[PDB]
Design a protein around this nucleic acid. Structure first.
Lengths: 305, 333, 333
RNA sequence: CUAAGAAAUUCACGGCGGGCUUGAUGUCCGCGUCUACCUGGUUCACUGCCGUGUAGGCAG
DNA sequence: AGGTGCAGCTGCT
DNA sequence: AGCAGCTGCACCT
């Protein structure tokens, strides 16, 4: 909804013990709402004090390593757990299953405020880096600096500054630092297109998002029906199960100063693509927006195609 | 005032997954290209060794059970046959702001908590807890079984302020025992550093590397995974070691549990050694919970007496509840 | 007073995987660059030699089975055609602190057990057990089938104190038999070193090298792995030998089982020879349990009569119980 | 302000027994690879002398 | 490697 | 003069 004046690049963020499940239907990469909440907490922590606002996230996922295993007689997978401490009677604990993972991801952050006006870009990038090197991203700790001495500093890049050809050249030289990983976008239009061409047989919507992201093996008219990209399920956001509630009227809230609601996950389709396949690097920024008259609390990435 | 219905303390002292590597002694200064210790598989054939029931002492049945072989596949990890030194490396960040909860439903309870921990820092610094954490980094307690029977353990801690090393500590981890808590000038300087990191006066980053001299080709002991059984199915591999990118590793929570083994104030004894800090302080190895709620020495009633009832406990119990604040947790009804 | 629910003992006498290399006899003092014995594959055409069911003893079916034989691929390990001596090398650390369990529930049970083993150490040292362990290192029992029919076996044992050798033993492993436990001055000095390691009064690390003179190109016998399935997607591979870094090797548990073959006090006989110390001391090669629980001479009843009811058995069975404690294991319900 | 906030898997083990993979074989006919070029771009940072000198210059 | 409730229970006053 | 907790038991597929 708002085109950023600049982009900051969190260069190579390594994360240990991040949450893998993140949804009652998916288990792979965590939800993009975690990254939107990351930059909102970053704006709350260091963004406000610099006359800077932050709006969206671009995520590329350089590497993944799930703590899973395959149980030797089956084609499915189980999660590796932790040994929680004993109960007060010293008997045992109750096993609740959580799914841990290790991540290598880079972040693309949009800026609208007085970016190069009040402060130079290098100091802003350095203290935003120093702030993000003290928190945790998706349930798991941001792993700090190791013998990776090279990938430390950021690149605060002004979007609309310079000539348009020079704009393409600096965004290409920034894409040169985003080569190994594959960026993630939302594909609600492709979802609705396949929903409409599937509805010629039957009007069902969740069966589409089932049939979109599996290996459909069609008989010989032995082939595999294939999508051109990497279509995955994602948690698309939240839809309320309840009307609004006042800060005091619900017991055991996180705070008695903020309204509460009961919600459900909306699920949609995302897509992993190579970062060279997009020409404008501000197309990948995941914005989260609230429609509080109803339950529609969304993360997406509009202005992408 | 009452307890807040939610209470959530983010942990401080975040460790990394400690990776293992191997090499020779007196090359440990050049130990940056040391190759990783990898996880192999092997086969074991055992016998019947467990306790039999009183109904199953029949000798013909015992022989008939022996004559069926018992075979397992086991993940193992060894040193190479020309290396005698295991190198275990992890990073530990100290954050600071140990008092603030991540979630509190009651505002006045969180303000009373904030001034309570503020008065606790004003009464004395973190130097007791910081000196005990620096002890647990000084002696190699995070080498869990790798320390046992080792010839010589040696710990190097690098405080890294910028992209390069700010300061270095060098310790003989076998002189510093696991039982008592001494005082040493380098150790007290590290204690000042980690106390200043805990006080919110900075964000301390540490790289801890431990060298244990075990022997040529001997067995090392990384963490084991938790695999729940596929019961009505085929037999599984009966041991699975933890590995990060084909390198044998210890879990992060294992290093964290080794770090906070500071509690020498549990009421049951004092010569059995320090234990890890947790509400109803319970060690899994003994299987028995010290600091029971029927006595008034567990964490919850001590916190309620200090905050809600304003009955300040003794200074070692304030150390204990402060360590449980640094440890983090999800408390509430 | 009853026994603990969980109770576990880590092993003392930790060996490594023994590696095989090959060379010529009387160059065995310069045997540091001897190349490893490698594992190769070969084809095997299997004949018909099983017992028939006698519902399949019809001659036409037998000749039809003989006309179409089956074939396998088989891992094999030989000496080179110019080398006649097999060198097998491993390291063994003696730790000490044998009575202390690594896990327990009852404090009273582990204190009774600790004072029981303390009384055992005070009655006699580890001299009998370390004498028998030093014998099993002196004769090269850890060469399981490679010792069989060897012309000359020689064992070099180096006590390694710092990174260099502290002391050296040289043994003719065919003079020291596999049957009885004699007395020798160098053997008693090695037994005193092993007993000092087992008593916690030192850190014992030994390097054991064994040279067997077998013949040029003869087959050696490394450890053997476990094969679950077999198909044509493989080479119909029906035998896999254990290997560490393209070296024929012996499992560490094989060397450990050959070390603790000390039990001469089992009630059935003594003219057979020693067996390995196990609870219900059993031989997989004989399919039989010596020390059946119907007799009162297995490990569990002897331990329960010693600790709970203070019925100390004979000193031979006390040696057997402490040998089972050094062996380690999981003893509980 | 992140389906947020929290967590010790673990002790012990003998995979070895034995084997014949064999017999027999024609690779072979045919073929256009051509046209045209500055190794110098300072490209040899050398050799000897006066001077105690490594300080400084000289001669070809 | 269970949550639940509730009956009964302890109690000392 | 009760209260609250607490432990223990049982259910159930």
């Amino acid at each position: 909804v708002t085109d950023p004046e600049a982009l900051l690049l969190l260069p190579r963020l390594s994360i240990q013990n991040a949450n893998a499940i993140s949804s009652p239907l998916t288990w792979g990469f965590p939800s993009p709402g975690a990254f939107t909440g990351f930059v909102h907490a970053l704006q709350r922590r260091v963004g406000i004090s610099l006359d800077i606002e932050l709006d969206g996230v671009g995520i590329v996922c350089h590497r993944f390593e799930a703590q899973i295993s395959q149980p030797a007689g089956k084609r499915t997978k189980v999660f590796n757990l932790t040994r929680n401490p004993l109960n007060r009677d010293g008997s045992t604990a109750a096993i609740v299953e959580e799914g841990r993972a290790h991540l290598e991801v880079s972040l693309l952050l949009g800026v609208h405020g007085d970016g190069l006006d009040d402060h130079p870009a290098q100091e802003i990038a350095r203290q935003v880096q120093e702030q993000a090197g003290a928190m945790r991203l998706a349930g798991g700790s941001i792993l700090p600096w190791c013998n990776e001495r090279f990938p430390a500093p950021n690149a605060e890049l002004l979007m609309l500054g310079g000539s348009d050809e020079q704009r393409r050249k600096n965004q290409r030289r920034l894409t040169r630092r985003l080569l190994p990983g594959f960026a993630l976008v939302s594909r609600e239009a492709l979802l609705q297109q396949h929903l409409e061409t599937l509805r010629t047989t039957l009007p069902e919507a969740t069966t589409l998002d089932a049939l979109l992201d599996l290996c459909r093996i069609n008989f010989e008219p032995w082939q595999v029906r294939d999508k051109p990209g990497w279509l995955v399920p994602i948690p698309a956001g939240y839809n309320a199960l309840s009307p609004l509630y006042l800060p005091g009227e619900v017991r055991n809230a996180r705070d008695r100063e903020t309204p509460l609601r009961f919600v459900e996950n909306l699920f949609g389709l995302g897509e992993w693509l190579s970062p060279h396949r997009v020409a404008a690097l501000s197309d990948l920024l995941w914005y989260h927006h609230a429609e509080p008259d109803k339950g529609l609390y969304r993360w997406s990435t509009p202005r992408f195609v | 005032l009452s307890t807040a219905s939610v209470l959530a303390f983010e942990r401080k002292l975040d460790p990394s997954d400690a990776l293992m590597s191997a090499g020779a002694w007196a090359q440990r200064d050049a130990s940056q290209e040391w190759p990783a210790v990898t996880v192999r598989e092997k086969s074991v054939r055992g016998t019947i060794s467990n306790r039999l029931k009183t109904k199953d002492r029949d000798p013909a049945k015992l022989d008939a059970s022996i004559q069926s072989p018992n075979l397992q596949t086991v993940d193992v990890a060894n040193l190479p046959s020309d290396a005698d030194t295991l190198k275990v490396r992890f990073t530990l960040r100290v954050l600071g702001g140990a008092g603030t909860p991540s979630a509190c439903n009651d505002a006045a309870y969180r303000d009373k908590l904030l001034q309570t921990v503020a008065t606790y820092v004003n009464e004395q610094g973190f130097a007791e807890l910081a000196r005990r954490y620096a002890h647990n980094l000084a002696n190699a307690r995070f080498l869990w079984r790798n320390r046992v029977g080792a010839e010589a353990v040696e710990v190097r801690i690098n405080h890294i302020r910028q992209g390069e090393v700010a300061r270095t500590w060098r310790f003989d981890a076998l002189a510093i025992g696991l039982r008592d808590f001494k005082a040493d000038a380098e150790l007290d300087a590290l204690a000042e550093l980690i106390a200043s990191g805990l006080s919110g006066s900075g964000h301390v980053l540490l790289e801890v590397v431990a060298f244990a001299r075990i022997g040529d080709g001997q067995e090392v002991f990384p963490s084991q995974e938790l695999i729940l059984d596929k019961g009505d199915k085929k037999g599984q591999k009966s041991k699975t070691l933890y590995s990060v990118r084909d390198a044998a590793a210890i879990h992060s929570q294992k290093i964290g549990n080794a770090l906070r083994t500071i509690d020498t104030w549990y009421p049951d004894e004092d010569g059995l050694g320090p234990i890890a800090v947790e509400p109803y302080g319970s060690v899994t190895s003994q299987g028995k919970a010290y600091r029971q709620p029927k006595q008034k020495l567990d964490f919850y009633t001590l916190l309620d007496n200090w905050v809600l009832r304003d009955e300040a406990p003794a200074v070692e119990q304030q150390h204990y509840v402060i360590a449980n604040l640094i440890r983090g947790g999800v408390f509430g009804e």
